[PDB]
Design a protein around this ligand. Structure first.
Ligand SMILES: [K+]
Ligand SMILES: [Mg+2]
Ligand SMILES: [Mg+2]
Ligand SMILES: [Mg+2]
Ligand SMILES: [Mg+2]
Ligand SMILES: [Mg+2]
Ligand SMILES: [Mg+2]
Ligand SMILES: [Mg+2]
Ligand SMILES: [Mg+2]
Ligand SMILES: [Mg+2]
Ligand SMILES: [Mg+2]
Ligand SMILES: [Mg+2]
Ligand SMILES: [Mg+2]
Ligand SMILES: [Mg+2]
Ligand SMILES: [Mg+2]
Ligand SMILES: [Mg+2]
Ligand SMILES: [Mg+2]
Ligand SMILES: [Mg+2]
Ligand SMILES: [Mg+2]
Ligand SMILES: [Mg+2]
Ligand SMILES: [Mg+2]
Ligand SMILES: [Mg+2]
Ligand SMILES: [Mg+2]
Ligand SMILES: [Mg+2]
Ligand SMILES: [Mg+2]
Ligand SMILES: [Mg+2]
Ligand SMILES: [Mg+2]
Ligand SMILES: [Mg+2]
Ligand SMILES: [Mg+2]
Ligand SMILES: [Mg+2]
Ligand SMILES: [Mg+2]
Ligand SMILES: [Mg+2]
Ligand SMILES: [Mg+2]
Ligand SMILES: [Mg+2]
Ligand SMILES: [Mg+2]
Ligand SMILES: [Mg+2]
Ligand SMILES: [Mg+2]
Ligand SMILES: [Mg+2]
Ligand SMILES: [Mg+2]
Ligand SMILES: [Mg+2]
Ligand SMILES: [Mg+2]
Ligand SMILES: [Mg+2]
Ligand SMILES: [Mg+2]
Ligand SMILES: [Mg+2]
Ligand SMILES: [Mg+2]
Ligand SMILES: [Mg+2]
Ligand SMILES: [Mg+2]
Ligand SMILES: [Mg+2]
Ligand SMILES: [Mg+2]
Ligand SMILES: [Mg+2]
Ligand SMILES: [Mg+2]
Ligand SMILES: [Mg+2]
Ligand SMILES: [Mg+2]
Ligand SMILES: [Mg+2]
Lengths: 271, 93, 46
RNA sequence: GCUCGCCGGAAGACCAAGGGUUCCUGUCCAACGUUAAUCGGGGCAGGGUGAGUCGACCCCUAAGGCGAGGCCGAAAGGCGUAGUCGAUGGGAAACAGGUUAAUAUUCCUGUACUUGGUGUUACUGCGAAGGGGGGACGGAGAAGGCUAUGUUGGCCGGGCGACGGUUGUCCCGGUUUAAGCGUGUAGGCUGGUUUUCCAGGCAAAUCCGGAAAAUCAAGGCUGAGGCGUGAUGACGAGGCACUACGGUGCUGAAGCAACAAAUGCCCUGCUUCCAGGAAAAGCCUCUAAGCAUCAGGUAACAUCAAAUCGUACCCCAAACCGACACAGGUGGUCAGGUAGAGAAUACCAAGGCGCUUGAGAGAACUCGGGUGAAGGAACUAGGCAAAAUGGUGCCGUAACUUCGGGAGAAGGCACGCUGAUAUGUAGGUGAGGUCCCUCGCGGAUGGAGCUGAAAUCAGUCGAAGAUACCAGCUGGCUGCAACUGUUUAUUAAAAACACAGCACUGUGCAAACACGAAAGUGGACGUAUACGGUGUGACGCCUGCCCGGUGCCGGAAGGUUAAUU
RNA sequence: AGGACCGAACCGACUAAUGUUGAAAAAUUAGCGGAUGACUUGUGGCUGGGGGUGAAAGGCCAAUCAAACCGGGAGAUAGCU
């Protein structure tokens, strides 16, 4: 559910929360947890290479089964869980032979549901199959770009991909960006949409809410001095320049894709 | 079994002070100056050999040398180890 | 007020100590210069 | 020595860091000490730091570092795998009393505890670089149960008062006791056991996970505190004797209860929220290659060992960082009384200090303050500064509003003491007693004693009762920025920055983009509800026309056009 | 519940006076803002000079910053004093 907070303080006046009370209120499942320390957007030269990253809350990494490789063995959903690492919720599933795993929670899945992967799985949300065994016209998510590599496409909350065509050993996918893209028909996908579609309705309400997420403030280029940024300087407010990145590249319209290796898989750019 | 050559080298001097006199007269402890790298076991074996008294226990400490002057010249006396060796109540060294 | 020199012996030794100097070639060149000058104290170690 | 004054959430006490003899004793007063100095953190000489249990060392890992091979790079070197380091975190064990001029959880006394090495006896499947479990973790909030501690009473010892009174409902003091061991309490968590079986735990496993059964229902874990013991002890108000008048020697009474009570403990609990909250070892357990009436396990006992290094002293400071014996700076721990909401504040305790020039005088003027006739902002750039308001309870409170606010709006009334209600109330606490027993640290009834606000009605003193300290000035119109935040360390705190929100735009993942000759790394163990860039800046109503110029996007016919040939 | 309210510790630094060969190369005193958070603080670590870092003041990078400090080219050059 989506809920507006009452304005008992200015920082709460605009807060809109997305509360899922289906989500397990306890601790995660420990065998599937790793530590992940923060970077502050710094690389192994110790330099900031992505701006505006730092602070925020401590988070453990949940090992999530993006490969969905346990074929023929059904699993039951034990519970849905909050995952701080990603917008989608995750679902702890228990396979019949006793193995527990985490998967991306698709829309509509709840505790008690049965799921399956393989060439024989039934066509229902949460089931994983190669896209040559999935009917053209299906909505899928967690789509592989190479067979056996694991899902890389349509993983974020509420996303999905549509299988629009199949030509021999390749399928044509319509991705959430609007791009039509070729992918080998031997790639696996999970049926349904990714759940938690109300994710995008939340309103942070205050600066500190973005700080909790490890986002540091953005200083506008025009607020700096010429030595700092191409937009810098000028008495009062002045621009008189085509807008650019901090490193001098046009930032309103200029395209930056350059990959002749993967051009052949793009059937139609997103426009 | 520590070597007798090792044992003959670790007891340097007996320490003479009011605290040492009172350790002898109140606790049956003798205060010695021992070799800087002397261990408690070595000091104990050396006293049990060369002074021929039974040793209950050895306590040790390192005295740091003072800074002194000499004709407008700074210098430093050596560190040196002190041992409180306790005898067994009736040994009477 | 807080002045610039705030001592820590660990940080001193890690930053300027004998082994830190020996860890890199430019550090060894520091030690070489200081020996050729005849410093009585090569490093902050002693 | 006697008085006086000052600090007392510190100006007391203990640490860490840092310093390093500044510690204690004798002697000396040249220089040092902003004066003198017989004194000193000064000179000189001597003394002083005692550990199986405290800390380091050690086992273990975090960020991060280094990094055999390796990948990369003119050289130097960069990055990184196996590994190996790295605390600010995890991992065994000791307390009370006494004692030195100067050390003490280290010495002594008394009473404990931990780990390992052996050496026997007894039952004996042990074995890991591998599996599982555990260690193991957030914020906020609520309430109970406690303790530290305090107050009173009882008890014990002492007193009978330099001036009216003081044998009493009078005065003073003391009334302290640990770790450990036994007990498993308030309370928190979990159903327990026993079987068959299995695409999971890189092999295996009797373990873990999963399934299916029968069976039994209180078993298991955790746990403050209390009680018993430790303890006939120690300590102990005082008294007595020496004094080398600095203190030691000897002796020692009471050693109880009730009430109040933490920010400490139970509690790494419980409840709840979203921003979803280390690792590795020690530890338990499972087995593999292997050893197999051998090694090895368990328990008992006996005996060994527990090394080395630190330990003095300062430590919100004259001993550290500031050139100074410098109104500065410096992390942690302890937390008494009266009043008070309080760690504010005032006065005090324990304790520690009077700040290393003094003596006079009592001009201008300067500094820090007190008071002020009449007037009351006339001052001035400006009410700058000052003056003023100030507490609690209750009455009462406007435009407007995003319905939360505005609001402590504004304005007002009461307020000390004594007595009664009620020889101390409402309430809290709760003994003996009686009863019951899933028989105890049990539970019910019982209410003695203790503690105890508020109010109302009378009376009463002062000019004044929130009496000191402490402690909002208030209202009206208007610009700007929504707001809490941030900023020019050292003349600018703002209308500047940020901001949630909005939009454009890039980006299909070996992403765009960024650091990097490169290898790589960040972005991200993310995947378009995502990520980068840019502008705008909550919210409400909105956001019109221009593609000529410049940029960007698309386009591919024609002209122009490089190396090349 | 809250980047909620009042208010100490703690963090800051709005006004005035003093001080300006200071007690102090930035403080003292009286007032002042925040005070459960975008808070504050200890220890250790990483980023290195046309480079870092910057809720952006050209701020800060050891009392030094529109290009740190040390050493070197180096006795730069100086139609100027
Ligand atoms: K500007
Ligand atoms: Mg950004
Ligand atoms: Mg933004
Ligand atoms: Mg500017
Ligand atoms: Mg430029
Ligand atoms: Mg302008
Ligand atoms: Mg213009
Ligand atoms: Mg020692
Ligand atoms: Mg000296
Ligand atoms: Mg002294
Ligand atoms: Mg003299
Ligand atoms: Mg003098
Ligand atoms: Mg001296
Ligand atoms: Mg001993
Ligand atoms: Mg590492
Ligand atoms: Mg390396
Ligand atoms: Mg190599
Ligand atoms: Mg190690
Ligand atoms: Mg540590
Ligand atoms: Mg002492
Ligand atoms: Mg008590
Ligand atoms: Mg508190
Ligand atoms: Mg000491
Ligand atoms: Mg002084
Ligand atoms: Mg001072
Ligand atoms: Mg105070
Ligand atoms: Mg005067
Ligand atoms: Mg005056
Ligand atoms: Mg006046
Ligand atoms: Mg007047
Ligand atoms: Mg008047
Ligand atoms: Mg008037
Ligand atoms: Mg006027
Ligand atoms: Mg005038
Ligand atoms: Mg004023
Ligand atoms: Mg005033
Ligand atoms: Mg105007
Ligand atoms: Mg503002
Ligand atoms: Mg503000
Ligand atoms: Mg300034
Ligand atoms: Mg500042
Ligand atoms: Mg200012
Ligand atoms: Mg990559
Ligand atoms: Mg605006
Ligand atoms: Mg703007
Ligand atoms: Mg607040
Ligand atoms: Mg402080
Ligand atoms: Mg002040
Ligand atoms: Mg405020
Ligand atoms: Mg406040
Ligand atoms: Mg500076
Ligand atoms: Mg330059
Ligand atoms: Mg030259
Ligand atoms: Mg010259």
């Amino acid at each position: 559910a989506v809920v507006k907070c009452k304005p008992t303080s200015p920082g709460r006046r605009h807060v809109v929360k997305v509360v899922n009370p289906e989500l397990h209120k306890g601790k995660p499942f420990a065998p599937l947890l790793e530590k992940n320390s923060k970077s502050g957007g710094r690389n192994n030269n110790g330099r900031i290479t992505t701006r505006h990253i730092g602070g925020g809350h401590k988070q453990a990494y949940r090992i999530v089964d993006f490969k969905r490789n346990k074929d023929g063995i059904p699993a039951v959903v034990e519970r849905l869980e909050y995952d701080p690492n990603r917008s989608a919720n995750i679902a702890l599933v228990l396979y019949k032979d006793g193995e527990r795993r985490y998967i991306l929670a698709p829309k509509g899945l709840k505790a008690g549901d049965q799921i399956q992967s393989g060439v024989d799985a039934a066509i229902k949300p949460g089931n994983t199959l190669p896209m040559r065994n999935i009917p053209v016209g299906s909505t899928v998510h967690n789509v592989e770009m190479k067979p056996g590599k694991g899902g890389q496409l349509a993983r974020s909350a509420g996303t999905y991909v549509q299988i629009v065509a199949r030509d021999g050993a390749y399928v044509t996918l319509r991705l959430r960006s609007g791009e039509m893209r070729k992918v080998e028909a031997d790639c696996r996908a999970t049926l349904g949409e990714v759940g938690n579609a109300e994710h995008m309705l939340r309103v942070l309400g205050k600066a500190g809410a973005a700080r909790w997420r490890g986002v540091r403030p953005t200083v506008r280029g025009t607020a700096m001095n010429p030595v700092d940024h191409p937009h810098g300087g000028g008495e009062g407010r002045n621009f008189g320049k085509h807008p650019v990145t901090p490193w001098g590249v046009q930032t309103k319209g200029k395209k930056t894709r350059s990959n002749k290796r993967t051009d052949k898989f793009i059937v139609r750019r997103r426009s | 079994m520590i070597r007798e050559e090792r044992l003959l080298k670790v007891l340097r001097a007996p320490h003479v002070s009011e605290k040492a006199s009172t350790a002898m007269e109140k606790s049956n402890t003798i205060v010695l100056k021992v070799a800087k790298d002397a261990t408690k076991a070595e000091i104990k074996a050396a006293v049990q050999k060369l002074f021929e008294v039974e040793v209950e226990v050895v306590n040790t400490l390192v005295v740091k040398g003072k800074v002194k002057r000499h004709g407008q010249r700074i210098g430093r006396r050596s560190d040196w180890k002190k041992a409180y060796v306790t005898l067994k109540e009736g040994q009477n060294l | 007020m807080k002045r610039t020199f705030q001592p820590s012996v660990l940080k001193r030794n890690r930053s300027h100590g004998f082994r830190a100097r020996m860890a890199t070639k430019n550090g060894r060149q520091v030690l070489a210069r200081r020996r050729a000058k005849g410093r009585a104290r090569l490093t902050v170690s002693k």
